[PDB]
């Protein structure tokens, strides 16, 4: 939720409960992390050497090995602290939304006709296909599709906003999520999901799931870290036969300390934390994802595909206009519009029957049982007509009316095209109502653009993402809406087959494709797009076919999705570069310290002017232990991604992190050695 | 002296980039499966006679073909060296080689290493130096050019499954890139004084009154392909110090040009096949910057030279010990960097007699994987591994999926690249460790102190990285040394060939994504510096603790 942006990393309440979860990670759950399993093996080895040297082993400096082993255990402790902190923040964000199903007061109907049934069925005894009647003030038990009634529910417990959203029967606002409070009159809801397989449990499996599979970028980074661990283990283990000939061989504890200081422990301990922190930040951005693979797929996105009615605009388009044409009087303005849209459950149809009726008191028509048979609305046909009697009343926009009715000889005249164009100038959806070969005229549907999305589309253009509209509506008012919204281009009069064709064409070029849709007709589009974002106000088919589901109903949520998906990869790469560049100063600290009795001439390599060999090794190990806990906030927050050019971004990240990993370990080791000398421990 | 060295490096790189661009354009035709002008018809009759149908084969069949030819040549060479007393063209009566020496110098010449633990004039006959150790000089070079041809074909082909024809590639390379060039190079060597004959050893009544026996043989024919294929297998004990092998400074300059000729032409062809010359220019810049820094460091170290020379009463402190008088310390330093960065291994001078700092840089240039203007084929597909790590890191730290030339770099070729870049540091570290705990490996040590471990490390590095250059103070004719180095060469070539082959087979199936605005450019000074830093850091973080007990300890002692 966005009512609280993020829980504090150190609130002094979960820190003590997740530090106790570290000692539970000390036993061999480290088997799945090879770098820190190497650190664990070295820590146990150094502890055994320290105990044996206290008891009866040949060397005598047991305190040095004890301190080395203690700090190597502290390194594992801090790595598990980072992992447990990320997982505990994830579990806290989970528990903040898992307690939304407080009460279970659902009545299961036997017939869906608004009443004649009242039960006391708990919400856990509801399956797919159970009609539920909810009065206002109650909460919604199940994630169900509304089949009757219109109400303004409040999805506060899911979205985090106080702004009510209206739900209706069919069309766009048919699907509602359970656990939310209806506020206005009533709703008849029919559940479509089994227990366990719900949207709340999808969020649960997203965030609190500790069995998180690794994304292929994390897998390849882990492979690279394993290769670095192998070369450093070999270069360290071969030092004993190399230095054994030229005098006295180096101590095994010194080799283990150098091995831990060399292997990428900084990224090795935070790699598990970066993914969980990214998913937690995505929960902070109100995006519900199936897995982190689709989240990281947003880094390569350069084209984005919205809609017009549901996505960019609110989708209501409730309006009442007239027809100034020949043969059409004031009664004739809406004699046929209400007749065509009586049995129409779309928001446009109900807006017609509640707006064009009150303008002239046209409530003469009763219920459609009195000799009326209608046809359903389908985007393939683009028509919502009715065969009420011998002559029919149909409702299309530009081409459906032509290709279906106007090929019957009675072609429509030109005098209505100018009025259609005048309607489309203002940004209203034109519906043309026709009586057989005679045309009544056109009515307008003023749709409101959602918020100030022009700045967000400018940001998307700045990030190198081409935002182009797909819609199946008239080309002129779609052009006006595109000009008012600020998108790059548009493609109007598109069937869902054409949407799929455009997605496949853009994928065949070699570009990753992002789709943001909400309607039922957008389900094959979201099932084929690489990065599919589903609107919360949309339909269950779209929310189940899309890879990700939005919550706060922002059309430009790809900005936050791209930011977080890029931030995870950039954090991983920057921490890897920092860990690799630290090894230069680790070498400059340990190699003259390690070879102080074998080759005394190597003391000229002590460019840090460190006090003692043991002090230098201890300072390097202490810095290795402390850099992980100092970079815990960076792993949790992610790096500061600024939308620059790729080359400029590489230059800035190199300048910060590679140069930092080359320089600040020198300062850190020198400061730690100075504190050790001041305290007198060495 | 600094101006003389600058002029030498400048004219060497200038003549190299002038000469290698037409050869790169010629090799791009062989990569693109287009016959060279005038070769059509001849190739038709030759392939019909040899049964080569010119059929496209996948990575498994290409790798199996390369490995099968390399083991067939290994068997032929090994039994030829064992039975060299029963073969003609033997003016002396040198016996057949022992099993250890024969296996070592068979695997060395098959694996493009050409390490010689023997003396050529008193070890092998003319047949053993001509029908073997020169046929393998051609074939080991062709078997690397074929692998880099397959890798470039994989990088340039879209959604295919077959690389090419290994037999067509090998025949085309050996008959039209290697033989017609090494013929002219050998003729110039005979012009300047190199041997080409089959006479018996010539007894000499010297001026003073002593006796010496001049060794003869087909020297120039082997020397030309030795330089051209980056082989490094000298006819005599001194690879390029022998006046019968490297008579003049013009000959030595042509030797350096032949060493860097095909590795530079392969980068030019890599640039030309993709249609983006900037990629090959990026590779050449990344190689040349490291090469110039290494050359300058080695020249300055050798000019500083022995500090004890000026104290003992000589004219200067210049280290001319272990160097020829025909070549300055500048020329010897440049050739020493060339032959150890290029995986050649032919010595103009005694790298043992080199100073500590001037011998450290050849070690590390070998140990980084021979990627800086490296071996033929292997200096480009070894550099592509560092390119894949560089693009992986860069794509991560800019926030995109890693890619090079459009093709994404996913988990499979990330594993394969990790293994390929992992094989040779593993081999050199385990080999040097095994040599330093065994008395049979420690007994070959000649110089005391850290320089003996420097000898052992240099030997294992050159064996594992297919260089073959030696300090030669290491008496590595023992069976333990022969078997260990032969294992190192075999694994160090054929455990980097197999993962690169699998990388090619994983990259043919992909499609090159179109160059968008957000994609990172894999050229320019930023990516040149990134690739240079990746190489200079990955190769250093492995070998600083190893080099610290050797040349660094010797230098600071």
């Amino acid at each position: 939720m966005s009512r609280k942006q993020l829980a504090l990393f150190e609130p002094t309440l979960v820190v003590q409960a997740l530090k106790e979860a570290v000692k539970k990670l000390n036993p061999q759950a480290q088997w799945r992390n090879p770098v820190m399993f190497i650190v664990w093996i070295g820590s146990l080895l150094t502890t055994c050497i320290s105990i044996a040297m206290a008891s009866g082993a040949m060397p005598g400096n047991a305190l040095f090995s004890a301190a080395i082993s203690g700090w190597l255990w502290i390194t594992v402790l801090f790595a598990n602290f980072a992992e447990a902190l990320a997982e505990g923040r994830s579990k806290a964000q989970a528990n903040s939304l898992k307690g939304v199903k407080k009460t279970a007061f659902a009545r299961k109907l036997r017939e869906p006709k608004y009443g004649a049934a009242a039960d006391k069925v708990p919400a856990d005894q509801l399956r797919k296909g159970d009609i539920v009647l909810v009065e206002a003030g109650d909460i919604i038990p199940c994630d169900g599709e509304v089949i009757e009634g219109g109400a303004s529910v409040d999805e506060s417990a899911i979205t985090g906003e106080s702004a009510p959203v209206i739900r209706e029967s069919g069309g766009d606002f048919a699907s509602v999520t359970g656990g939310t409070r209806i506020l206005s009159d009533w709703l008849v809801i029919e559940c479509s999901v089994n227990p366990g397989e719900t949207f709340l449990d999808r969020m649960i499996a997203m965030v609190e799931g500790a069995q998180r599979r690794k994304t292929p970028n994390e897998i390849a980074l882990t492979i690279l870290l394993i290769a670095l661990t192998i070369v450093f283990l070999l270069a360290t283990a071969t030092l004993w036969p190399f230095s054994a000939w030229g005098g006295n061989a180096v101590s095994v504890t010194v080799l283990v300390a150098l091995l831990v200081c060399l292997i990428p422990t900084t990224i090795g301990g935070l790699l598990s934390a970066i993914g969980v922190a990214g998913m937690s930040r995505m929960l902070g951005a109100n995006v519900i994802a199936t897995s982190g693979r689709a989240v990281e797929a947003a880094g390569d996105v350069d084209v984005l595909l919205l809609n017009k009615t549901g996505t960019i605009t609110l989708g209501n388009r409730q309006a009442s206009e007239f027809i100034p044409a020949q043969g059409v009087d004031e009664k004739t303005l809406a004699d046929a519009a209400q007749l065509a849209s009586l049995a129409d459950e779309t928001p446009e149809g109900r807006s017609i029957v509640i707006l064009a009726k009150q303008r002239f008191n046209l409530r003469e028509r009763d219920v459609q049982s009195l000799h009326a048979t209608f046809v359903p609305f389908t985007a393939q046909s683009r028509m919502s007509g009715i065969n009420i009697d011998n002559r029919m009343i149909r409702k299309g926009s530009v081409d459906a009316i032509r290709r279906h009715v106007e090929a019957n000889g009675g072609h429509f005249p030109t005098d209505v095209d100018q009025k259609v164009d005048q309607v489309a100038r203002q940004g209203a959806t034109p519906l043309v109502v026709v009586e057989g070969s005679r045309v009544l005229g056109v009515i307008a549907l003023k749709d409101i653009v959602k918020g100030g999305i022009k700045e967000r589309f400018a940001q998307l253009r700045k990030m190198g993402i081409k935002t182009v509209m797909i819609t199946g509506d008239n080309r002129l008012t779609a052009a006006a809406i595109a000009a008012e919204a600020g998108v790059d281009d548009f493609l109007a009069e598109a069937t869902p087959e054409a949407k799929l064709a455009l997605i496949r064409q853009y994928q065949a070029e070699g570009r990753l494709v992002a789709m943001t849709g909400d309607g039922t007709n957008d389900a094959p589009a979201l099932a084929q797009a690489d990065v599919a974002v589903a609107m919360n106000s949309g339909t269950q088919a779209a929310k189940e076919a899309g890879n990700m589901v939005d919550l706060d109903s922002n059309p430009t949520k790809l900005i936050e999705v791209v930011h977080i998906g890029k931030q995870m990869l950039m954090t991983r790469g920057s921490l890897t570069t920092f860990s690799i560049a630290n090894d230069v100063a680790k070498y400059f600290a340990i190699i003259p310290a390690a070879f102080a009795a074998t080759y005394p001439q190597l003391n000229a390599l002590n460019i840090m002017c460190l006090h003692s060999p043991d002090s230098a090794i201890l300072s390097a190990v202490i810095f290795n232990a402390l850099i992980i806990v100092f970079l815990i906030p960076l792993a949790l927050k992610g790096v500061s991604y600024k939308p620059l050019t790729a080359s400029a971004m590489l230059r800035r990240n190199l300048w910060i992190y590679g140069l930092g990993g080359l320089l600040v370990p020198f300062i850190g080791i020198k400061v730690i050695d100075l504190l050790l000398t001041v305290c007198g421990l060495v | 002296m600094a101006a003389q060295g600058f002029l030498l490096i400048a004219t060497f790189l200038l003549v190299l980039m002038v000469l290698a661009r037409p050869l790169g354009s010629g090799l791009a035709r062989l990569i693109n499966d287009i016959p060279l002008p005038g070769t059509t018809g001849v190739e038709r009759v030759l392939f019909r006679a040899l049964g080569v149908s010119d059929r496209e084969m996948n990575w498994k069949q290409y790798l199996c073909a390369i490995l099968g030819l390399n083991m067939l040549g290994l068997a032929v060479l090994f039994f030829m060296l064992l039975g060299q007393h029963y073969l003609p063209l033997n003016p002396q009566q040198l016996p057949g080689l022992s099993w250890d020496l024969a296996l070592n110098t068979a695997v060395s010449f098959v694996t493009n290493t050409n390490w010689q633990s023997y003396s050529g004039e008193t070890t092998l006959s003319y047949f053993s130096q001509m029908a073997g150790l020169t046929v393998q000089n051609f074939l080991s070079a062709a078997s690397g050019i074929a692998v880099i041809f397959a890798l470039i074909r994989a990088f340039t082909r879209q959604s295919m499954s077959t690389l090419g024809n290994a037999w067509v590639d090998l025949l085309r390379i050996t008959l039209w890139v290697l033989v017609p060039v090494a013929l002219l190079i050998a003729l110039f060597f005979i012009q300047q004084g190199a041997l080409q004959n089959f006479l018996p050893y010539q007894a000499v009544n010297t001026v003073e009154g002593a006796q010496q026996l001049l060794p003869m043989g087909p020297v120039a024919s082997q020397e030309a392909i030795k330089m051209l294929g980056t082989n490094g297998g000298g006819f005599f004990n001194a690879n390029s110090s022998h006046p019968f092998e490297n008579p003049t400074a013009l000959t030595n300059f042509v030797q350096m040009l032949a060493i860097f000729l095909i590795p530079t032409a392969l980068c030019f062809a890599f640039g030309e096949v993709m249609g983006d010359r900037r990629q090959g220019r990026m590779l050449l810049w990344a190689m040349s910057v490291i090469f110039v820094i290494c050359v300058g460091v080695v020249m300055w170290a050798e000019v500083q030279g022995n500090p004890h020379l000026l104290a003992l009463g000589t004219d200067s402190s210049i280290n001319m010990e272990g160097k020829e008088s025909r070549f300055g310390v500048l020329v010897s330093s440049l050739f020493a960097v060339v032959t150890t960065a290029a995986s050649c291994g032919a010595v103009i001078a005694m790298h043992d007699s080199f100073t500590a700092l001037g011998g450290m840089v050849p070690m590390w240039l070998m140990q980084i994987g021979e990627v800086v203007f490296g071996g033929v084929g292997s200096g480009l597909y070894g550099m592509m591994l560092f390119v894949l790590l560089a693009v992986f890191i860069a794509g991560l730290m800019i926030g995109r999926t890693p890619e090079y030339l459009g093709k994404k770099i996913d988990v499979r070729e990330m594993k394969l690249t990790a293994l390929a870049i992992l094989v040779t540091p593993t081999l050199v570290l385990m080999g040097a460790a095994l040599a330093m705990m065994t008395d049979a490996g420690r007994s070959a040590m000649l110089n005391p102190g850290p320089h003996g471990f420097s000898e052992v490390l240099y030997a294992v590095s050159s064996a594992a990285n297919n260089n073959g250059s030696a300090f030669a103070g290491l008496s590595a004719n023992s069976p333990f040394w022969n078997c260990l180095l032969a294992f190192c060469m075999f694994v160090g070539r054929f455990g980097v060939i197999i993962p690169v082959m699998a990388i090619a087979g994983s990259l043919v199936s992909k499609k090159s994504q179109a160059a968008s605005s957000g994609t990172l450019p894999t050229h320019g000074p930023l990516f040149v510096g990134l690739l240079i830093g990746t190489v200079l850091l990955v190769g250093a973080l492995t070998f600083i603790p190893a080099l610290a007990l050797g040349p660094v300890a010797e230098y600071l002692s």
């Binding site: 190497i38 690794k214 290769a227 283990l233 070999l234 004993w240 | 705990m437």
Partner: peptide, 27 residues
Amino acid sequence: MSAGVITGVLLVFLLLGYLVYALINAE
């Protein structure tokens, strides 16, 4: 070469084998 060298070489070999197995696997 005593037991303290033999067990060190054996443990380094075991760690290398474990790391190579972890490199090949996608655990």
